[PDB]
Design a protein around this ligand. Structure first.
Ligand SMILES: NC[C@H]1O[C@H](O[C@H]2[C@H](O)[C@@H](O[C@H]3O[C@H](CO)[C@@H](O)[C@H](N)[C@H]3O)[C@H](N)C[C@@H]2N)[C@H](O)[C@@H](O)[C@@H]1O
Ligand SMILES: CC(C)(C)n1nc(Cc2cccc3ccccc23)c2c(N)ncnc21
Ligand SMILES: [Cl-]
Ligand code: NA
Ligand code: NA
Length: 272
């Protein structure tokens, strides 16, 4: 061959991409996350022969967040059912992410609507989580390991960003610094690393026609201990019953739940 190739030719302007102000055309609009942490979100609906869309707009540091979800959406969709990216734009202070909506209701909503199906619903969740954790880690370009997350948590703590009102019952009213200190007493342990979602909660898994058809909110996707996802989902199931909590582990394939790793990941999520 031949190296250090830097060969220039004259060219006319290429054909540029169709703009954002085009995909979104005939739609209704609604802000769905008023007062929350993160982007402005627009629900676009009501176009004949066109699917429902969401458009996230992040400004400043939140633009980095939206950019983070976009690349993770792009990567993970080869393995899992996710919203498809219709259009994404990054400028120096803004990011815009246009995605298709996944029809259906959240796992939380389905559990509430179908309480007599709790056990079948948890079975579906475990199968879906097993599918995610079966993606070979060698395929994943994203790091979500505990060293990375612990540094993010330290930062949020030092910047006053930890929501101390939202701690689990067993840490109710604890100072953030106490959670930090006690959490470190669970370390170290050997990670059992898999492709994790990062916020595998009942709000982020979508059911339609009785089947688990997708997951959303993938900005924290990356390689981490499997308990990162087990802990968050186990926690949510506590709003329903301890039997369903137990069932999650059993159906996922863990007979002997590692209480230390469970506790560690529950505590880590307090900071986020
Ligand atoms: N700050 C932003 C984050 O806020 C929530 O995450 C928080 C959980 O809600 C808390 O737990 C409470 O809610 C659970 C159900 O969600 C219940 O099972 C549990 N008993 C409750 O104590 C947990 N302590 C901390 C975690 N950061 C959202 O889910 C997450 O998407 C969002 O990014
Ligand atoms: C953009 C993001 C917040 C990540 N998102 N959220 C959902 C859930 C959801 C389902 C049905 C109606 C809703 C109305 C307001 C907010 C969310 C709704 C959702 C989804 N189904 N499909 C794709 N993205 C979704
Ligand atoms: Cl029980
Ligand atoms: Na997909
Ligand atoms: Na709990």
């Amino acid at each position: 061959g031949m190296s250090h190739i830097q060969r220039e030719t004259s060219c006319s302007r290429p054909r540029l991409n169709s703009n954002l102000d085009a995909d979104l055309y005939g739609y209704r609009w609604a802000r769905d996350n008023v007062g929350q942490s993160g982007a402005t979100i627009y629900r676009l609906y009501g176009k004949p022969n066109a699917p429902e869309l969401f458009l996230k707009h992040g400004k400043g540091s939140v633009a980095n967040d939206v950019t983070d979800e976009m690349v993770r959406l792009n990567w993970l969709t080869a393995f899992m059912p996710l919203p498809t990216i219709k259009h994404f734009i990054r400028t120096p202070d803004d990011a815009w992410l246009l995605t298709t909506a996944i029809p259906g209701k959240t796992a939380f909503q389905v559990l509430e609507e179908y309480p007599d199906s709790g056990e079948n619903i948890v079975d579906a969740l475990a199968v879906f989580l097993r599918r995610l954790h079966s993606i070979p880690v060698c395929n994943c370009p994203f790091n979500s390991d505990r060293v990375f997350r612990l540094a993010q948590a330290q930062s949020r703590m030092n910047n006053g960003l930890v929501d101390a009102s939202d701690f689990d019952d067993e840490r109710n009213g604890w100072p953030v610094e106490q959670v930090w200190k006690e959490m470190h007493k669970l370390l170290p342990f050997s990670p059992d690393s898999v492709v994790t979602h990062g916020d595998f909660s009942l709000d982020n898994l979508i059911f339609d026609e009785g089947k688990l058809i997708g997951c959303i909110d993938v900005g924290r996707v990356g390689i981490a201990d499997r308990y990162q996802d087990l802990a968050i989902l186990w926690n949510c199931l506590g709003e329903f019953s301890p039997s369903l909590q137990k069932r999650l582990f059993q159906k996922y394939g863990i007979d002997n739940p590692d209480m230390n790793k469970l506790q560690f990941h529950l505590m880590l999520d307090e900071f986020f």
